[PDB]
């Protein structure tokens, strides 16, 4: 079950700035032509976010912290990213959350998983489902429409929070044509679900699919290739935001009060 993809291609982590991104509707209320000041876990403006690549032989799916929240943005064109994994130790000793996506559906579980180091999915093109070697004490299950739907054209932005015992996800899909990094601009994330997983989360990891079509050797850390793909991770902090609203009810603008004295 465990194919260690220990291809050794060391590249330094690349950092980028998030101009104005990660803004989400704090509440399920309608407001129009009004400026509203709210305090919630937001991604600070012009924040130093990490950059990860999956281009060839570079694969980036390390374990990352979940301090208070995550702004996950993926510029993709092949649905290589299929979901994420959340947990503390990512082993059978503790419960963990798994979000994965089959074509036209989603699988969510909060069940003791002995996650497989270098977890992944595969493309030939269903292929492989090597993510966990075990599932025990399985408590929560849920299925819904795909969270991820269809060079680097679509920008899937996700915000994850683990308030008290509810896992909240805010998502948005924005088509673009930029191929280098985040498109400077604006877009608000609407709420998607509020999962009552009721677990403890401190670390998370991303699940990327691999392509093995032209030739298939012993499927070790070899005979695999990842299409061009990258994702950006930003950590939210308690911040006070001034949100603008238009006639329709969309935000369209915001201000980070603590960014600098001018914004304050």
């Amino acid at each position: 079950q465990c194919v260690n993809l220990t291809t050794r291609t060391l590249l330094p982590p690349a950092y980028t700035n998030s101009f104005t991104r990660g803004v989400y509707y704090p509440d399920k209320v309608f407001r129009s032509s009004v400026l509203h000041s709210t305090q919630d876990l937001f991604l600070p403006f012009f924040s130093n976010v990490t950059w990860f690549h999956a281009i060839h032989k570079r694969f980036d799916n390390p374990v990352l912290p979940f301090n208070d929240g995550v702004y996950f943005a993926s510029t993709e064109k092949s649905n290589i990213i299929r979901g994420w994994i959340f947990g503390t130790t990512l082993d059978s000793k503790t419960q963990s959350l798994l979000i994965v996506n089959n074509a036209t559906n989603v699988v969510i579980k909060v069940c003791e998983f002995q996650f497989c180091n270098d977890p992944f999915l595969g493309v030939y093109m269903e292929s492989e489902f090597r993510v966990y070697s075990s599932a025990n004490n399985c408590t929560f299950e849920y299925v819904s429409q795909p969270f991820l739907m269809d060079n680097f054209k679509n920008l899937r932005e996700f915000v994850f929070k683990n308030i008290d015992g509810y896992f909240k996800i805010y998502s948005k899909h924005t088509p673009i044509n930029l191929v280098r990094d985040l498109p400077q601009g604006f877009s608000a994330l609407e709420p998607l679900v509020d999962l009552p997983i009721g677990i403890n989360i401190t670390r998370f990891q991303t699940l990327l699919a691999l392509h093995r079509s032209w030739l298939t050797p012993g499927d070790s850390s070899s005979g695999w290739t990842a299409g061009a793909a990258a994702y950006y991770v930003g950590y939210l902090q308690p911040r006070t935001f001034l949100l603008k609203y238009n006639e329709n009810g969309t935000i369209t603008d915001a201000v980070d009060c603590a960014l600098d004295p001018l914004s304050e």
Partner: protein
Amino acid sequence: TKCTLKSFTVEKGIYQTSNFRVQPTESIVRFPNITNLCPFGEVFNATRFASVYAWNRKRISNCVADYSVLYNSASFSTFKCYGVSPTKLNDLCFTNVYADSFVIRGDEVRQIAPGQTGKIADYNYKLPDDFTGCVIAWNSNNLDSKVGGNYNYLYRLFRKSNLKPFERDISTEIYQAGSTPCNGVEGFNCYFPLQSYGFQPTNGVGYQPYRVVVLSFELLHAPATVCGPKKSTNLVKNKCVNFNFNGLTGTGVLTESNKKFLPFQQFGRDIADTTDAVRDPQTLEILDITPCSFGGVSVITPGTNTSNEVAVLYQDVNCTETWRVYSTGSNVFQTRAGCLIGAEHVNNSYECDIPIGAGICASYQTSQSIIA
């Protein structure tokens, strides 16, 4: 005006009274058309409840909440509702209802509340301080007790740290209570965190089992998939009414709106915190709520030691256009300040005796009468 001045005599002048009120005539209710009844039996009348350390959470949706069905079946020793009054549960609709069920001993029922401490609260089941919901409990000695002991119910006794609200820890790992590490094996100063409740019919009320159900929900601010037994009525527009949209009472006029609400949005607010819009659950159409009271009212009177007849100035009324007036009169004069009733226009011009408004002054003259 006399009540406002706390006197029975009003000296000559003009006074400002309360704005024009219109009292509502109808009282409508609009709940989603739901006929199914909530799974009261499966939550309260189900055998084989879960242990506190692995408390089960059940989602509840698309059901009417008529708790009167429980009166004949079961009686609850404890029933506390936080963030809502029990009397209003029949007139409310709930957004995200979750039923958390488990079994504990009577001594530990008090621990099921925000701000408490103990093994249950700290290690097994913790409630948030800002908790909206209700807590229910009832003895189950006749059910969860057996001769010789029932050890199927367990509770976490040792943990490295206190739990966070609505957090479940099913981990079964040997607790290290000392500096010496023990790896997956029980030993001196090392304990198995889980322990079994000793439930017997003979033991006291304190150690007797208690089946606890915790209902967590949000009131308003979002679509309400669960509703009470109150009956909906027909829709009324362009008329002051006492509405109830998914438990949100109020008073105002309802009209069609051009606003577009996203699927997750039910209510709408203005610069203030006030529901200026709402979505009808049955018709899925947007409505605009507008207060019915609107317009200043001013009273023009002489000293009342000279005459008891008065004139009323209705600001924000254009009689030149069922006017928003308390009582219509034969003499109506329109002014830039507003419609003046009870005073007759005279084409002459005198010094101002009573400063009505823009360029209009009243007086008492001539069978005397009020003039403008």
